[PDB]
């Protein structure tokens, strides 16, 4: 048996546009992914996030499923255009009411929020003026980050500025398979630069009103794909933790099994990566994403996804071997809590511990959900 | 009685985003008005054009209503993002199929198409790159105009480049009440400049394939709002075949203004003139299956008098189009302003001809009106 540290965080992760739905309800403005998934040829089978998991309306049931899972932490993202329909200025009280109710529901059931500010849903009004190529987007994000800290920070104490900014810059500005769908390295550089500045000014605004919580960033360090004043501002933004998203390693040759994404399953790469960061850097590490897509089928009311079981099992061995050698892994989040809209793959890729039937919105916990509940309860593995 | 020329065009007018619906169906990409109407605070009551009059699916019933009306011409717009979901590149075959079916349905009922290329629905993909502040949008519009000419021009003989480009530039870039919702005069200037260049490049592309149909543009010269020298001459190099006039008022009802303008265009310019828009919004209600919009009759009749006084003074008016054929999505006013000759109930999509439809039908049948001292 393999035990984890006592207060180790056990959670699952989602993202706003991937589960929320209610895209054009209750004062939410459109994001670039609303535009992207309404454009033919961009997303598998014309899927969009108009409805998604309808989590906006069904959050109470979803929080209750988290409690039965036994989570002590839940990673979600705030939809920027649900707070500021134009990215800045007018605030949506209804959007604030939703995340206040969500946060309070999580704490009522012993679940600690782990909130991501930007999870790729840039407000479309900002993209009309250039998006991340225009510095006024940086201003808007800082105002946006401020609003979230002031109204949610008394309850939220784990914050993330950006989810895989390195990946969005590549897929959105280099390969063009993600919005804003361009292929120009000079644009990618400018977008990346202002992403760093927006990160730094949000990190500083958090420290400037001083919450007992922490804030960091998340990166995937081996992903698989389908003037002067700014520099000083950027490097003065020291972190409290680093979030690691691991799925596979783009370097794998060894004949390995493959997921439903085509991704080779290679948990030892997680172990080494954890080691490499421990030697280079000393900050706390949270595995903010780790999961597997499976061709899941609801059977006789059940989904027997033992594939996903052994993937997470073998990856939770790798993290355990790392902590045994001093690496300060302080938490673990499965991607994902529920099947959802997986960007350009649409709904054809299921990562959830919980199956979602999109015709009925019925939630069916996968077998991995019942096994994960034991892992949290035992705080370890066999 | 006041009689019009034998070949005078009698029609009604619509615009793609205002009636079509099917906004995210059959290969259509989003327009800036899709984005605009999905943003809170931009459109009255949060209305949008997702469904509108569902004309995309109900076009054959609508064409049947046009023939009952007696129309010989019908002014509609082609949705640029229905032809090119991103404004340039891959062409949507289903979009070409729809307008081919529409035009063929019109001509089989003796109705002459009067097509507008740009009626305010810029593909959102091009707005992401700056929209009309970006010269690449000029290129995309030229290619767009070309595609339509090739696939539709063998049947279509009357073409409009832009509907009130002067109004869009003010409302989209100075006032900010229309998308892309900016308030900057220098941006209004640059957008205006690119619009004229795109107009000129499309006019010259039409002459390069030399279909002996006609090309022109539409302007409202009394709107209410309720140096690249090689460019500039390229603008002036784009001579017209006709001018389209949109008149509503100078909303004060003021038909004398119409006649005044018609002759000064006859004085100052000379092009054939089609009044491509004329109409009035009324608080229409269905009282037991009927709409008694006598107001709309008065407005039209009085304005049909002004055009008739101008024509017997030699003004070369060649056609007249009612705005609108049917109630529709009136931009930031949403569905709260009805301009149609035909009432549309948006819960059932049921079409109910108003009293003006029956009155306009007889005007066409008798090619004129009836007067008194």
Author numbering:
A (entry chain A): 8 to 233, 284 to 309, 322 to 451
B (entry chain B): 8 to 233, 283 to 306, 332 to 454
Can you list sentences taken from the study reporting this PDB entry?
Family 1 glycosidases (GH1) commonly function as β-glucosidases and β-galactosidases, although other activities are also found in the family. GH1 enzymes are present in the three domains of life and have been traced back to LUCA23. We focus on a putative ancestor of modern bacterial and eukaryotic enzymes and find a number of unusual properties that clearly differentiate the ancestor from the properties of its modern descendants. Unexpectedly, the ancestral glycosidase binds heme tightly at a well-defined site in the structure with concomitant allosteric increase in enzyme activity.
